[PDB]
Amino acid sequence: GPKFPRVKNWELGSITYDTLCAQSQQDGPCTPRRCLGSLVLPRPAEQLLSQARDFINQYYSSIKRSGSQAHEERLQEVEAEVASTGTYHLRESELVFGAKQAWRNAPRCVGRIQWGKLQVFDARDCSSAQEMFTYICNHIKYATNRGNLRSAITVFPQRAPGRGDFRIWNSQLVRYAGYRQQDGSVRGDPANVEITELCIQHGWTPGNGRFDVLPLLLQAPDEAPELFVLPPELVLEVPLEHPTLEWFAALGLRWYALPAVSNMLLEIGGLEFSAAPFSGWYMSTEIGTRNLCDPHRYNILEDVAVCMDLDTRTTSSLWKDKAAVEINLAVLHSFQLAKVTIVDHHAATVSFMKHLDNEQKARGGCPADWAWIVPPISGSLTPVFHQEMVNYILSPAFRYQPDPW
Amino acid sequence: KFPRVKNWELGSITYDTLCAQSQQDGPCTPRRCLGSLVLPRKPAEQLLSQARDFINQYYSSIKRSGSQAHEERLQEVEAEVASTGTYHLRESELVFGAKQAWRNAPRCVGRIQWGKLQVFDARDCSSAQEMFTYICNHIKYATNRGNLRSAITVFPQRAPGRGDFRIWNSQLVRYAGYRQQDGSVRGDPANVEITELCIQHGWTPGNGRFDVLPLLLQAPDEAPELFVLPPELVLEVPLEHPTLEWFAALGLRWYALPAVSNMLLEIGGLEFSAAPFSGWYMSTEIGTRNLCDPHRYNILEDVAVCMDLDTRTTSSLWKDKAAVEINLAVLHSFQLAKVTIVDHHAATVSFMKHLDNEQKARGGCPADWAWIVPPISGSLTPVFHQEMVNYILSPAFRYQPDPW
C-alpha cells in the first residue's frame, strides 16, 4: 500500500496510515539501528524565520485563509520584524491557536480529546515576580472553579535576546514537600526533595508533615527568584477514603485537585515561552498508582496491603495488585464524593481512542507515545494497549527545559 | 553517542554499547519512532559474512578464537559456501546459536534462563511423519509431568531449491476457534483461521471451548498433513480460585506448555523455518491476555457478574478487580496442579537481574519495553521504571509469512 507508517489496532483488526508524520520538522532519538522510544528524556537568524513562516502558515490554514492577502501580509510583517529586531511577536489569536496546537501535539498526553477547550490567559505584559504571582493565583482560581475543573494555560513573556527568562522554579504549581530525614528516609514526597531544599535555602520556614504545600519560587528576568506562599484556601485538596474499607480514611492520605505543570517550555513559531504553566484535571492512576505507590514516591503499597491483611511475603499472592486496585478505587471515590473532576483510566483511554479517530480524519495521524499513553495499572484492559502508535515531534510543542539553577 | 539508559526508580545509569554490534535495521527513523508496531512492515558474500561473524561468535564463546580449530572451521564454511552457495552448522554450533537467539530476543522477559535450553537436533527429518515424532518427543520432554523444561527442536534449514519445512500452527498447543454463522466465535477467536484450515484438511471438528487442535505439518513442497496429539501428551490445568467457589464452575482451563512453532530461527545466515521452542508461562499471558482480551475468550464481564460487581460504570474498577482474581486463579491452579509457572512480579525481578548480568557480560541488552512490562500492574513491577534499548542482534528468532 501507501509510503507512510502503517498503523494497526490488534483488537479491532483495523489499519490506518499516518501521513501527518511527514509534517515533523524535528528529529527524535531513534535510528534504523536502535529504538530509544522508552527513554524519558533522550539527549537564531534565518532559523527563526523559517519556523515562524511555518507557524504562520499553520495559523492561516486553521482559519482557512492560506495564500490570502492577510496571510501574505502577516508573513511580510514577521520577516520585517525579525529583520529589524532579531525576533517577532504573536498576535493574540496566534498565541491562543498555538497554545491549543502545542497541547494537541503533545505525544505523551492521554487527555487530548479536550484540546480544543483550553482557556489561554495572555500574561505577556507581566513585568515582576509579584505580578507573576497574581497571574498564577488567578489561573488557579479559574482552573479549580471549586472542583469543576477547567483546562487553562497562562502565558508569560517570551525569551528575549540577552534578557533573563521568566521562570517558575517548581515543576508544578502544587507540590508537597519532601524532607530528608537523619536516617536517610524522606518525609512527604521524595520527588520534591530538591525543590524543598531550594525553598529553604531561599528563606522558606519548613513544616514537617507528609502533605505540606510548597511555596512558589518565581523568577522575573535577571532577578533571584522570590518566594510566594499560596493562600491555603486556593489549593483545593481531597482527603482520601475508600468506599467499603472503613479504615482507609484513618491513613490520612490526600491529594490536591489541580495538576498544573509549571516548568515546561512552550515553543510556538520559534518563539520560546519559558514560563507558561498549564493545567487540566487528573487521571486517577496518576494519583493512585504513580504518586502513591511508586517505590520512589509515597510508596504506600505495603502499608495498605498490611491493613487488608494480605500475604506480603510472597509475590504470587498478588498483594501488590490488589492493594493498588483499592488505592485507585479510593482515589476515584474520594474525588467523586468531593465533587472534584477526575477521570478513571478506562474512560480516559476510551476517549483517547475517539481522539485518535477524530485526528485521523482531521490531520491523517496523531503523534503518540505508547509507553506514556497506556496506563500504569491494567494496561491491556484499556483499548490503547492494543493500538499501535507513531511517535514524532510537531511544533508548536511543550518541551522539557533545564532547571534554572 | 552510545545510548545512556536510566532506571527512574533507582537513579542509576548505564550505557549501551552492545547496540554497535547490530547489523539489521528495525522500523524507526529520526523523523518517527515505530517501536509500538507488532510486525515489521518490511548473494554469497552476504551469507559468507554472517557465517564468519557467527563462527567468530562461537569460537569466542568457547574461549578458542585464533586457534587452529577456529581457523580450519572458517576455511570449511568458506569452502562450502564457495562451492555450493550454502553451508551446514555443526551440532555444537547449532546448540550455541539457538541459546544466543533466545538471549537476543528483545520481547522475552524470561531470558534469565537463556543458558538452560535443551536443544533437539531434528535436521535429519525427511517427512511430516518424522516431524510429528520429533514434536511428540519435544512435548514429552518439555512437559516432564509439570516440571517444565525449556526446549527447542530444530528441523532442516531452508534451501534455495525447495519449499520449507513448516508447522502451520502458531503454537504446538492451541484451542479451536469455531465461528458461529451469527458473528460469534466458540473457543479461541485467535484460532479461527487455523481451525478452518484443519477442518478443510480433513479434521473432524469438535464443538467445545477448549478443543485441542491437531497439528498441520509440512514437508517441502507437499500439502500439509494432519496429526492429532495423543490426549495424554497435552497437559492441562483446570482453573479454580483459592477462595471463590463458583470460579471452578466457570469450566475454565489452560494448557501447561507454551510452545511457539511458527517463528524462523536464523543462525549464521542459515534459516530454520521450523524450530518450535518452549518454556513455561508467565501467569499474565493466560490470566490477562488469553482470558481477558476483548478479542480472545473475553471473560471479564462474566467474572465481574459472578463477583457481584457494579458493571454499569468504569469507575467501580470492576475490570481491574476481576482481572486480578482471574490472574490469582491461574497462579493458584497451576501451583495446585504442580505445574511450573511464574507470576509477573517474580518474572520482572528476574529480568532486572538479567539486565545487570548482560550489562557486565556484553555491555547491554536488547529489550522491547512494551512487551517486557506486563499487561496489568505495569508500574508495580521494576521494569516499568527501566529505560530499554531495542535492536536486532543475530542469532535471532524472526517472524515469517504464513505458508498458505
Ligand code: HEM
Ligand atoms: C484535561 C485533562 C487532562 C488529562 C486527564 C490529561 C492527562 C495526562 C496524563 C495522564 C499525562 C501523563 C502524566 C504523567 O504520567 O506524569 C499527561 C501528560 C501531558 N499532558 Fe495532559 N491531560 C490533560 C490536560 C492537559 C493540558 C490542559 C495540557 C496542556 C495544555 C496537557 C499537556 C500535557 C503534556 C505536555 C504532557 C506531558 C508531560 C511530561 O512529559 O512530563 N494536558 N496528560
Ligand code: HEM
Ligand atoms: C522459561 C520460561 C520463559 C518465560 C517465562 C518466557 C516469557 C515470555 C513472555 C511473557 C513473552 C511475551 C509473550 C507474549 O506476550 O505473547 C515472551 C516472548 C518471547 N520469548 Fe520467552 N519466555 C520463556 C522462555 C523462552 C524460550 C525457551 C524461548 C526460545 C528459546 C523464548 C523466546 C521468546 C521469544 C522469541 C519471544 C517473542 C515472541 C513473539 O514475538 O511473539 N522464551 N517470553
Ligand SMILES: Cc1cc(N)nc(COC[C@H](N)[C@H](C)OCc2cc(C)cc(N)n2)c1
Ligand atoms: C496538565 C496535566 C494534566 C494531568 N492530568 N497530568 C499531568 C501530569 O504532569 C506530570 C508530569 N508529566 C511530570 C511529573 O513532569 C515532571 C518531569 C520532571 C522530570 C525531571 C522529567 C520528566 N519527564 N517529567 C499534567
Ligand SMILES: Cc1cc(N)nc(COC[C@H](N)[C@H](C)OCc2cc(C)cc(N)n2)c1
Ligand atoms: C517460549 C514462550 C514462553 C512463554 N511464557 N510465552 C510465550 C508466548 O508465546 C506467545 C507468542 N509470543 C504470541 C502468540 O505471538 C505470536 C504473534 C502472532 C502475530 C500475528 C504477530 C506477532 N507479533 N506475534 C513463549
Ligand SMILES: C[C@H](O)[C@H](O)[C@H]1CNc2nc(N)[nH]c(=O)c2N1
Ligand atoms: C522507563 C519509562 O520510560 C518510564 O518509567 C515511563 C514509562 N511510562 C510512563 N507513562 C506516564 N504516563 N508517565 C510516566 O512517568 C512514565 N514513565
Ligand SMILES: C[C@H](O)[C@H](O)[C@H]1CNc2nc(N)[nH]c(=O)c2N1
Ligand atoms: C500495539 C502494541 O504494541 C501491542 O498491543 C503489544 C503491546 N505489548 C505486548 N506485550 C506482550 N508481552 N505481548 C503482546 O502481545 C503485546 N502486544
Ligand SMILES: [Zn+2]
Ligand atoms: Zn523507536
